[PDB]
Subunit: 250 residues, 4 copies
């Protein structure tokens, strides 16, 4: 089991990429708490992966600072000290910078930027200096590297996550905290939400978007996260891991 | 005059880098409005560069959304349609991610991230489709490329500016708006604020920080901004311009 | 076994990083041919990992174009069609650009650049369109991202490998070849050759070099290569994977 | 005159980008030697810009190491000590990595990589420690950042130039040589050679290639080179300057 003894929080773990991360984490021996906004979805998601000795759902919005405190306490009460934080919760807005309302701007940043900050800050505090082989995996995207004219606020958030994570990685390394911090950068990934938008997958699969001519699947992101959570990656910190079908290579 | 006919807003234009940008912009034939928080400083700054036929001060906090509207109106009433926006206002917090309070986080992002968003969004709206050769110059820094363990929130802000700017550049290019958007990335620059912090310049001048073994001066940033504001750079958009003494090259 | 059915060529596989890659590849079910310059070293290396049903040594200099042809034939005769090429062979020269002789320049590029080209070109030709889940892993380094004043020719070679690999990745993706191409970028890795240079590890472990305050081990590079060789990484192509203790994050 | 007192060598200065660099350098007060392969073209090019008190042609192939020595001597005899080297000579091959012959590979690298090495190495040696405000401008391209499946060897060369230049920049900075080294990265630029290839400009102008929906002109590259040659850029070293119509921003 590649994640023997690990205890992970996966935010936005009830759908899509986060769900697959949780699934493979459990497969590799981790205990996992998944978060999401909705109880129906979250309880189904947890039980689809395993019983409560290995996976539990907690309703939590990543923008909710006070709830973060409680989430660590709930997770540690269930499974012992947290070792691994996957800051995956996120939302999207389909607006150019020009067309973004300030309400849209603040709402997207409250999840995609504040939530990652809250989980990273608290993860460092609660995991440092415990010999846990701790790992914080911050979910950026291809939009942390390149612009998309239709994703202005999203681009801001993903670029912020990219560089903030390097700061945290460095501080943890220099202080010998036994905490690593890295970013994962998915390209386009097939999910029910993509399937719900007519034409989206075909748009994303054009060669001028994804050179492989198709989009990825959630397990593509799960497997790089297993590597990063595991002690196999004990010398990797402050780095970006891109799984994008070639999107950013052209 | 390399900026003949240009009309620029330079936020945080009363001190340091912004002041030098304003100075060289006026030298190259632009009309300039500089903003800053404090009237004493701002009125002295404007008159040190020129008379009110070429430069004026407006008291404005870049985090103040409603004031942005008014700032464009004031500038256009003085000098005619704005052509050039330099989003330079910024603040700093000397805290690791771990140690950043949420108040510090939100306050820094309100200037360094929201202010750049507000000026970029409004600049696109008010400059597009006017044949102005319009240019938005967003001030990132070396901390938009690399982490600094002591500058967590600052890193978040500068990474956000870096990538958000690419989104805006692309939208403007694809829609033929005649608006370019680029980022400038200073390394360490000698200013009175650096001089006020005992030991700072020597720290910044170590070869492991700045390979040139000294730090820069405000005109180093002014001259790259003249290039970017001018029609000389009409094919440059979505790009990062690094003036850092080699900091990021190692 | 994470590399079930894979058949790998690991150049420079008799020492250091390459040896560890070969070791973990065999552990994960691959068949492996390792190359190196010297028979004594190579035969000991192969037998330290396994018997000839899983690993064999072939004496080969990666700069030797004609030998590449033969190497694929030898490997396929032993183990069946090659699926995985790790272009790891390399040499180093400790000279600034200013001080590099043309002989040094050409010799280093013949291994570090031509060898990677030869293995990549031939790997595409011999692995495309066979449903192998083929993967070409080109060993760049931190010196593919940042300069080192003492490693001028080495920097040239590693930057060339970095970007050439993206070209190959794209061509393979666009043509549906079922071949991925990625680069791995080690930071400093403890080996007998580092141990032989008095003071080297301490130099490399300074916080201004490696923020973790120590250097890595060969298995750190082996494990990212297992991920990249395996079908777990089927959506990763054209990307750079950095395992450097934080070197490039500051 | 922004280049008062400068003495520049511009390789491949008889056509296209190099010709425009030479033209604007002379306009800004520099003395210039342009090189090229062909006397007819070179003598016409020089006289189109000015008389022999400001510009001269020397027939030289950048791959010719012995000729480099002589080129500096010729230039210094004409105009005094060289201050500025623009390594612009280059060739292209339209082949994937898979399809590149070794002859094509070596020939392209002899100009695009060896020529830049020869000019950089010799420029450092002959310009260091003379108080000249010396500047080496190495012409990379967008193909130093991103792959193109049809430009495998070209990608290798441009990535090598990109990173080798950082090594040189650092060495010069650390040793206080008064020599800066930077790379320029053109996107697509309209020239007679592009005009000669039916359909090329339209291909390059598609929004999925160049977001501005058109390609650039040689003066777009000349003006960034004026900035980099001038003392305005005295704090810029080891950096990449991208003028690409947005190509790399998406
Ligand atoms: Cl979903
Ligand atoms: Cl100041
Ligand atoms: Cl060794
Ligand atoms: Cl031409
Ligand atoms: Mg319908
Ligand atoms: Mg004191
Ligand atoms: Mg001794
Ligand atoms: Mg660095
Ligand atoms: Mg025809
Ligand atoms: Mg791209």
């Amino acid at each position: 089991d590649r994640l023997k003894g690990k205890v992970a929080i996966v935010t936005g773990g009830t759908l899509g990429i986060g769900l697959a991360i949780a699934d493979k984490f459990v497969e590799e021996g981790a205990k996992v708490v998944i978060t999401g906004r909705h109880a129906d979805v979250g309880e189904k998601a947890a039980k689809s992966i395993g019983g409560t000795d290995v996976i539990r759902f907690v309703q939590h919005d990543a923008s909710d600072e006070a709830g973060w405190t409680k989430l660590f306490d709930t997770t540690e009460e269930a499974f012992g000290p947290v070792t691994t934080v996957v800051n995956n919760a996120g939302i999207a807005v389909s607006k150019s910078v020009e067309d973004t309302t300030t309400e849209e701007w603040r709402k997207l940043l409250s999840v995609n930027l504040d939530g990652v900050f809250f989980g990273t800050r608290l993860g460092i505090q609660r995991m440092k200096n415990k010999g846990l082989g701790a790992s914080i995996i911050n979910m950026s995207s291809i939009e942390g590297f390149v612009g998309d004219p239709t994703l202005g606020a999203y681009n801001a958030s993903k670029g912020a996550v990219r560089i903030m994570s390097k700061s945290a990685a460095l501080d943890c390394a220099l202080k010998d905290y036994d905490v690593r911090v890295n970013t994962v950068h998915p390209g386009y990934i097939k999910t029910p939400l993509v399937d719900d938008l007519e034409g989206a997958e075909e748009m994303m699969s054009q060669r001028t978007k994804t050179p492989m001519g198709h989009i990825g699947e959630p397990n593509d992101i799960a497997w790089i996260c297993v590597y990063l959570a595991s002690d196999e990656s004990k010398f990797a910190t402050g780095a970006e891991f891109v799984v994008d079908g070639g999107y950013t290579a052209q």
